[PDB]
C-alpha cells in the first residue's frame, strides 16, 4: 500500500481517487490519501468548489516514484510532484499518518471494479498518449483536445490517441472499398492490431484509458475515441473469440460504473444501438447488452 501526502488544502475542492470522491473544505487539515493499492495505475483528480469548470487530474503508478500534491497559488491548481529524496518522503508521510491527517483508499475486499476498469492500462502507454516526458505522472483535464481533433491547437497539450477514421485510405484498401467499409476486419486486425497496437491488450488499454478520461474529466475527445474503438470491433465480422469475450467484460464494467445521470452525454445512441442491435457482433456482447437494456433502455 502506498501514499500520496498533500502539502495542504488551501482551496475548497472535490478530490477524486479512482472511482471514489470526497469533499475537502478550504484550509481543512487534509494531508492526503493512504493505503493506495500497489499494482494498478491510479488517477487523482480535482474539481474546485468555486469553479466547477476544468476538472483536472494526474494518472500515476506508485511503483514509479514517490509523488505528493501541493497547491500552486500562481497557477491555481493542485499539482502533482515527485520527491526524489526517499528518506525525506517516508519521514514526511509517517508524521502525517501518526497524526491521522489522511483519508484511506476505501477498497472493499469483494470489489474488483478498479481492476476491471484498468486491466489493460499501463503507465508507459499513458505517457505516450499524454506527452510530457520530464514527469512520471500524466496530467489530463476536461478541455484537452485529441490529435485527431486538432486535424479537424497546442500539440504539447494534446491527447495523442491512435487516430481511427472509417473513411480514410488507411481504413480502406484500393479495390475493396465496399468490402472494407461494411466489414472492417482488415482495419481492425491487420492495420490496427497487427500494425499499430501490436496486440489486443494495448488496444484495450487505450480504449479503457479513453473511457476513464471521458468519465472523470468529461473530456469529449476521449469519449469520441472510446466509441470509435468499440465501433471498430463491433463493425468487424472477424474478431478473435477471446477479444469479444473480453470486450464484453470491459464494457460491462464501464457501463456499470458510469454515473446514472451522465448517461445522456457520455453514451452515443447511434454507436450503442448499432453495436448491440445491427453490427456483426450484435449477438456477442451478452453481458454488456443485458446491463445496457436494464439500466439505460431509453437510449435504446
Amino acid at each position: 500500500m502506498n501514499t500520496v501526502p498533500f502539502t495542504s488544502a488551501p482551496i475548497e475542492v472535490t478530490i477524486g481517487i479512482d472511482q471514489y470522491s470526497f469533499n475537502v473544505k478550504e484550509n481543512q487539515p487534509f494531508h492526503g490519501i493512504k493505503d493506495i493499492p500497489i499494482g494498478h495505475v491510479h488517477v487523482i483528480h480535482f474539481q474546485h468548489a468555486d469553479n466547477s469548470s476544468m476538472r483536472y487530474g494526474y494518472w500515476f503508478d506508485c511503483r514509479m516514484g514517490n509523488f505528493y500534491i501541493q497547491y500552486d497559488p500562481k497557477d491555481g491548481l493542485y499539482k502533482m510532484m515527485e520527491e526524489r529524496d526517499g528518506a525525506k518522503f517516508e519521514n514526511i508521510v509517517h508524521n502525517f499518518k501518526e497524526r491521522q491527517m489522511m483519508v484511506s483508499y476505501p477498497k472493499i475486499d469483494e470489489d474488483d471494479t478498479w481492476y476491471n476498469l484498468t486491466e489493460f492500462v499501463q503507465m508507459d502507454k499513458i505517457r505516450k498518449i499524454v506527452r510530457k516526458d520530464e514527469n512520471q505522472f500524466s496530467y489530463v483535464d476536461s478541455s484537452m483536445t485529441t490529435v485527431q481533433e486538432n486535424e479537424l491547437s497546442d500539440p504539447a497539450h494534446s491527447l495523442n490517441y491512435t487516430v481511427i477514421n472509417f473513411k480514410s485510405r488507411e481504413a480502406i484498401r484500393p479495390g475493396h472499398e465496399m468490402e472494407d467499409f461494411l466489414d472492417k476486419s482488415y482495419y481492425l486486425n491487420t492495420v490496427m492490431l497487427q500494425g499499430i497496437f501490436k496486440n489486443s491488450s494495448n488496444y484495450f488499454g487505450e480504449l479503457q484509458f479513453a473511457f476513464l478520461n471521458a468519465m472523470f474529466f468529461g473530456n469529449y475527445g476521449s469519449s469520441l475515441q472510446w466509441h470509435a474503438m468499440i465501433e471498430l470491433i463491433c463493425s468487424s465480422a472477424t474478431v478473435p473469440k477471446h477479444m469479444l469475450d473480453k470486450l464484453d467484460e470491459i464494457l460491462y464494467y464501464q457501463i456499470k460504473t458510469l454515473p446514472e445521470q451522465y448517461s445522456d452525454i457520455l453514451l452515443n445512441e447511434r454507436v450503442w444501438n448499432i453495436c448491440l442491435y445491427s453490427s456483426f457482433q450484435k449477438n456477442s456482447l451478452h453481458n454488456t447488452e443485458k446491463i445496457m437494456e436494464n439500466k439505460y433502455p431509453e437510449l435504446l
Binding site: 473513411k167 480514410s168 485510405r169 480502406i172 472499398e177 465496399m178 467499409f181
Partner: protein, 237 residues
C-alpha cells in the same frame, strides 16, 4: 453541404460539376415462379452522370452480368455506381475532373465518398431538389442503347441537343427537368406531346425533336398543363 433552392445558380457557374443519379442502375422485373413463389429477373441498367452546364451525359450501361452471383444487390448497386463514377473521374484529364459531384440520393454519399478518398479536393454533396432523373429511361434513344447492350459500355450524349446555341444552361436545365418531370408523371401523354406533329423530327445525332423557339414554348406550356393535370387527377382538385 446540401444543394437546394437557395443555391440553384451554382449549377451553372464555371466550376466543373456532375450530378449522379443511381435510380436506374439496378432494375428488375418481378414475376411468379412455377411453384407460385416470386422471383426477380434483372434487366440492364445505367448510371446517369450529367454535367448541368454543358449537357454532357456520361451514360454508363450496367449489364445484368454484373449482378451474377452477387447478394444484396440494392446495396451493391450503390457501390458499383460509386466505383464507375470514380473510374470515370480517373479517366478524365485533371482539368476536366469535377470539383463537386452532387448525388441525387443520400444513400450514395458514403459509397462515393469512400471510392473517392484519392480525390480529397472533390466535394461530394447531396441535394434537397426532387430531380426527375429517374425518367431518363423514358428517353427512347437512351432506353434503346441500355436494352441492346450485351456487355458493359459507356455511351456519351449531350442531353441538351443543340439548345445551348440559343439558350443559357439555366434555361436548358429548366427545360430538361420539365420534360423529365412530365415523362415521369405520365409517360404516354408526355410522349404524345413531343411527337404528335410528324413534321418535327429528331435528328439522328439528337435525343429530342427539332423544335423552333416558338414550338418549344408551346411544348413547354403543354408539359406544364400535363403536370398540373396529373396533379389533379391524382389528388382530385
Amino acid at each position: 453541404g446540401a444543394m437546394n433552392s437557395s443555391n440553384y445558380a451554382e449549377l451553372f457557374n464555371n466550376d466543373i460539376k456532375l450530378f449522379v443519379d443511381d435510380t436506374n442502375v439496378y432494375r428488375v422485373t418481378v414475376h411468379k415462379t412455377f411453384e407460385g413463389n416470386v422471383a426477380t429477373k434483372a434487366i440492364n441498367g445505367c448510371i446517369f452522370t450529367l454535367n448541368p452546364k454543358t449537357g454532357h451525359l456520361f451514360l454508363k450501361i450496367i449489364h445484368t452480368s454484373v449482378w451474377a452471383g452477387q447478394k444484396r444487390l440494392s446495396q451493391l448497386a450503390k457501390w458499383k455506381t460509386a466505383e464507375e463514377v470514380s473510374a470515370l473521374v480517373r479517366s478524365l484529364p485533371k482539368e476536366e475532373q469535377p470539383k463537386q459531384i452532387i448525388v441525387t440520393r443520400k444513400a450514395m454519399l458514403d459509397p462515393l465518398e469512400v471510392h473517392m478518398l484519392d480525390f480529397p479536393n472533390i466535394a461530394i454533396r447531396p441535394t434537397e431538389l426532387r430531380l426527375p432523373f429517374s425518367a431518363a429511361m423514358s428517353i427512347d434513344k437512351l432506353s434503346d442503347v441500355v436494352m441492346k447492350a450485351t456487355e458493359p459500355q459507356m455511351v456519351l450524349f449531350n442531353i441538351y441537343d443543340d439548345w445551348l446555341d440559343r439558350i443559357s444552361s439555366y434555361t436548358a436545365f429548366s427545360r430538361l427537368t420539365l420534360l423529365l418531370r412530365a415523362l415521369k408523371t405520365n409517360e404516354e401523354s408526355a410522349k404524345m406531346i413531343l411527337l404528335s406533329d410528324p413534321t418535327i423530327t429528331i435528328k439522328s445525332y439528337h435525343l429530342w425533336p427539332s423544335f423552333t423557339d416558338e414550338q418549344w414554348i408551346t411544348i413547354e406550356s403543354q408539359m406544364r398543363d400535363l403536370i398540373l393535370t396529373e396533379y389533379g387527377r391524382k389528388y382530385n382538385v
